[PDB]
Write a protein that binds this DNA or RNA. Structure first.
Lengths: 198, 210, 135
RNA sequence: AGCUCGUGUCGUGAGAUGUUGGGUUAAGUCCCGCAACGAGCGCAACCCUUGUCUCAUGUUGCCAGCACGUUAUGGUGGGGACUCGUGAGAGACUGCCGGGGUCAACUCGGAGGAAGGUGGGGAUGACGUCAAGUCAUCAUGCCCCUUAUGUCCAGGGCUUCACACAUGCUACAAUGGCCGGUACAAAGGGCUGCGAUGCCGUGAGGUGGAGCGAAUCCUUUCAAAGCCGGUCUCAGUUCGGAUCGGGGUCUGCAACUCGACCCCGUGAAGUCGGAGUCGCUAGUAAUCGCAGAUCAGCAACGCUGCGGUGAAUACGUUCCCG
RNA sequence: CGGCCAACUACGUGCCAGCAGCCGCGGUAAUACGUAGGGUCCGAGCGUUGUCCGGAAUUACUGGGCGUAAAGAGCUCGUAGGUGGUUUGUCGCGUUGUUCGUGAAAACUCACAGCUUAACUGUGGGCGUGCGGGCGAUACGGGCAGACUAGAGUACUGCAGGGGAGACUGGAAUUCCUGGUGUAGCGGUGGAAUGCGCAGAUAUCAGGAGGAACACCGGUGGCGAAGGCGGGUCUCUGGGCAGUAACUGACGCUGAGGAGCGAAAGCGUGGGGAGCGAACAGGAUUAGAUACCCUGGUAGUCCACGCCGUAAACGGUGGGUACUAGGUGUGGGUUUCCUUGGGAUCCGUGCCGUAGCUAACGCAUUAAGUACCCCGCCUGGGGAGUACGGCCGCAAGGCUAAAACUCAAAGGAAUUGACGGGGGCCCGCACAAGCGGCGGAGCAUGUGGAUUAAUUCGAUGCAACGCGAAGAACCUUAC
């Protein structure tokens, strides 16, 4: 990924809507032996997302690096994924496993900061979280820890969803501090939203 | 390795015309010598200018030197000042008198020689070579009407020690078909690390037009 | 005739075969047969022959449909997995050996009998015509 | 005869699939299937030459029917009839019939036809390999020389020779040698070039210049092997020509080191060749001359082409090689 | 101021001199060595070395594993131990609630005050995760006292079986023996030769000896805890399964050490010794065979009595228990229905298959799935299952089991290729069928080598060597 700063007198750079947040995690040239030598190709693990908390995971195969990055962008574009939150935190401590990828995603009080390793830091920095506390146990990789983090975010659910599963009136599903954090986060959603209307 | 014959020399009987045209018995070696020194004399300032084709028709010892380029305005500066200087030096180097016709190609991105010009002159200018190859292409495919597009760049690419050849294309470029109308142009970039020889194949169409 | 793999998920490639089929039939109403070499004419006879005999419905489709009706979820598994993958609801016939969890709106029954299967085709085809009448 | 790619699907991933299966092909040629559907570079086709005919076609080319030659022949008035020369066009497509084919591709036979199934041969080298070759064709990055590693000339060398390899040529003879008579080519080459009749030589050649920038003139009307005849009688020879001596001619300022050719003599090895190994499947192999480029001359037995005469064998994939 | 890891250019040496935490940088164009500019990070400091915690979920209580990656004892029985179905009562030992006492000060944490600020110091809380006393609770664990029948075991009726041991015996075949019949070969091999023969072999017939192994049934089949077990019959004995529910009433599970069983080879003493056969000869093959192949051949293989204790003792999967879609074979037994056919059931053993699981292959009601109980075991590769020491053993050896040192890996599964003296299907003057040659002779050209003042320079498997040269007397021409 070099020589991107450019000014063209051509038709268009085609800049348009959906200015999302896009992170390229790792690139390892992938070789293939054929008759008389090696054929080098490229893999780019592409994370895309918006600051609401919708995450994509794309996996680009091409024999050029920006081609593989662009194919990962289109593949994560094809496949988004909804993550439920509280304010800008996570709901409750989970462990995700993608066959060797263990990631523990635990919430924290706000202000602490996204503390995670670089793959999980990528998937969570694209997402709508600002203050959680994760760790990547096992598998020491990028692909399995990204995919394990997304499986960990599939083990998430709303407080309300849990209440619904059990047919119980909330209050009765959460404890009270987390309901107060719901009041804080929806209150600042009201403040920034009504400042957004004017 | 790739033992690929120059396709403008592989279809020079069938589709592509000769560049130089006369008849000569016992005057032929002299006409060859004048043809060579004329093309060396039209190498430098016209390769600054954007030269593509240098045809020399030759009637009863006058001469007619015709050049197809991509900017009438650098070849013809002030009228007669830039034209009649190289024209007059062609009149003095040859022992003859020169009728220099200068004409523009309707699309510079259509000619394979001029694509090799713009690519190699970008590649001497420290740009990214894969970015350069992509730039020349795509835009060329649409420009006028091309079917083939082969850009091979060998040499010290990016200043590296290994001489890596690259091979990008789009569409149909059949070399073994003789009704191909393929334009071919190889021009050689001059970096400080060395020379990056650029080959460009451009397949315009199936049309014989016999 | 034969379920081509990747009709629904890959529509952007198999639509090009359709426009080439339109250019073939529009050059069949043209009448250029003798001006070309007959190896190319017999070759286009093979292209129109196979491409018309195997592709008849997407000739009318154009439009990445909202529903799919499936006979024999077992044998036509490719269509049911592709139809599930886009989010398109599946309406099917289900024998004793078909997994009903892949089909959202089933109609259970034997598929081996032409009377029963063909009658259920009459059911849902009359249903679609009943949709067309009030529209 | 393969090498890939796009988009879809499969897989955590490298990747796969497509491109595998059934049949078919000179061929990933082509059909039928199949989570693939398509494309691209190859293969084929387009181009040149060879094989048949049609139309056009008349000099420098042909000469039948005409006329005139006599010595020498199309040599000459003439003629488009035959060639031939070069332009356009037809013609081979499994197109037509029989059988196998899954009623698909394709294969076995037959007819017509100059030609039958990619008719013959070319030109045409995919993605890449081998750090293959070339900084001496050229161009060139960097390093080195700049009082020499530049440059000018004479002489020498690149041709030396106890050897060893490699590709060729002439042979070892009677399907042959030598003398005499005689018949048939194709293509080419030519300006300070190709150079005829005639004369002088034994012969390289000398003297001379006809005539041609060449379907015309010259390379003789072109060949050699072929055919008819005579002689040689199986031998180190009328085989074989190396070597060496004498005597010349031509080219060039100059043939000593180092040119070719001719004449006279000289007359060696060599009796079909160990282990092995190479080429070739039809106008091929084998053998026979001819021309060309480079070139003042030639180390040309080389290279590139042209034609002449012209075979044997292929049961078949076990074995060696790719 | 390569990468991690904020920060790059030139000059100088070109596998040297040096660098480096690991990966790794130096073979005349190093952003990795040395010097320079320049940048970055810190700052009265900044680097190095050592020692500890961290990252290391890498000794995993919180928080790991054991089919193939390190890792399931060869298999059982059982001592301590750990663990415990249903239910009534009681105790208050575990557990829990509360209050009292205590946990010195300092530190630590929160607030505040004081020193120009801060470090620092002080005041007041909290912390002091604990322990002892009093009072309360009784679900769960436990103790005691009882009750129950589903687990466990017993009785009864059957049933299947190479389960084991002892004893007696059967035939086919191999070898030798005596006797016929009868002649020059037999045997053996890719091809042969040592070898047995011509003194009567091999061949065939009759009889005799003796030993071992059990054709056919017999296989993806039965039984055993695992090793393992197949001629027959008899005698003694072990386990399993089903059915009824008659009895006992939790007597269960596992099991550190421990005892027992445990293929083959091997060991001791005494028998036996046909076939096969290590070692050991000769023969052959081969460069050479201390090998394969051949001919002979001793211990051994066999039995009696003991040792030994090991195996790819492998399902590479410790034992127990409950649950979790199915489909189809076959083994043992009960019953409802058609009336042997299906159904249902309990126990067994295979093949395919969801969910789920796994690194992947795979597993998948006979789990590698979901959970509980107990045991074994693993902690990078070598060094090494080795030394030292002890224990057992007649010995061979087994068991238990390190360190220095060294490496930056050693591994598992799958992928793309190449490769195979792997398989299949194909082709090419690839072989076969022919014809003509080369290799021996003379010369012509080119190369090697040696010469030389100079023998200019290039091109050395196929794809260099009548090749750059389509013309070396001078020129060419580089020497």
């Amino acid at each position: 990924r070099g020589r991107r700063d450019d000014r063209g007198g051509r038709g268009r750079d085609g800049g348009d809507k959906s200015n999302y947040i896009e992170r390229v995690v790792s690139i390892n040239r992938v070789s293939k032996v054929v008759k008389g030598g090696r054929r080098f190709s490229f893999t780019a693990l592409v994370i895309v997302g918006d600051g609401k908390g919708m995450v994509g995971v794309g996996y680009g195969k091409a024999k050029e690096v920006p081609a593989a990055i662009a194919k990962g962008v289109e593949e994560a574009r094809k496949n988004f994924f909804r993550v439920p939150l509280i304010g800008s935190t996570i709901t409750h401590p989970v462990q995700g496993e993608a066959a060797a990828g263990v990631v523990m995603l635990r919430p924290a009080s706000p202000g602490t900061g996204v503390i995670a390793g670089g793959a999980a830091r990528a998937v969570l920095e694209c997402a709508g979280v600002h203050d959680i506390l994760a760790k990547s146990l096992g598998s020491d990789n990028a692909i399995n820890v990204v995919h394990a983090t997304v499986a960990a975010l599939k083990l998430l659910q709303r407080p309300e969803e849990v209440a619904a599963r059990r047919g119980l009136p909330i209050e009765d599903v959460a404890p009270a501090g987390m309901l107060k954090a719901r009041r804080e986060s929806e209150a600042l959603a009201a403040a920034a939203a009504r400042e957004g209307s004017a | 390795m790739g033992q690929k014959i120059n396709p403008h020399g592989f279809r020079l009987g069938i589709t592509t015309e000769w560049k130089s045209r006369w008849y000569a018995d016992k005057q032929y070696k002299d006409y060859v010598k004048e043809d060579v020194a004329i093309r060396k004399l039209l190498a430098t300032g016209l390769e600054r200018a954007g030269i593509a084709d240098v045809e020399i028709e030759r009637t009863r010892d006058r001469v007619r030197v015709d050049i197809h380029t991509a900017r009438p305005g650098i070849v013809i500066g002030r009228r007669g000042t830039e034209a009649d200087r190289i024209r007059a030096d062609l009149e003095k180097l040859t022992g003859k008198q020169v009728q220099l016709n200068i004409l523009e190609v309707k699309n510079p991105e259509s000619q394979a020689q001029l694509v090799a010009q713009g690519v190699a002159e970008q590649l001497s200018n420290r740009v990214a070579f894969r970015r350069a190859m992509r730039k020349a292409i795509q835009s060329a495919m649409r420009q006028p009407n091309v079917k083939g597009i082969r850009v091979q760049c060998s040499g010290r690419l990016g200043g590296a020690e290994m001489s890596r050849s690259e091979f990008y294309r789009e569409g149909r470029v059949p070399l073994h078909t003789l009704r191909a109308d393929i334009d071919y142009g190889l021009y050689e970039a001059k970096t400080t690390f060395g020379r990056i020889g650029v080959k460009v194949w451009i397949y315009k169409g199936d049309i014989v037009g016999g | 005739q034969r379920w081509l793999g990747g009709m629904l998920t890959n529509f952007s490639t198999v639509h090009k075969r359709l426009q080439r089929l339109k250019e073939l039939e529009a050059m069949e109403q043209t009448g250029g047969f003798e001006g070309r070499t007959k190896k190319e004419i017999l070759m286009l006879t093979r292209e129109k022959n196979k491409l018309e005999r195997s592709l008849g419905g997407i000739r009318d489709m154009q439009k990445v449909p909202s529903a799919v009706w499936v006979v024999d979820t077992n044998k036509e598994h490719i269509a049911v997995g592709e139809a599930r993958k886009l989010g398109i609801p599946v309406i099917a016939i289900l024998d004793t050996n078909c997994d009903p969890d892949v089909v959202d709106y089933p109609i259970p029954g034997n598929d081996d009998a032409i009377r029963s299967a063909a009658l259920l085709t009459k059911v849902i085809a009359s249903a679609v015509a009943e949709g067309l009448q009030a529209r």
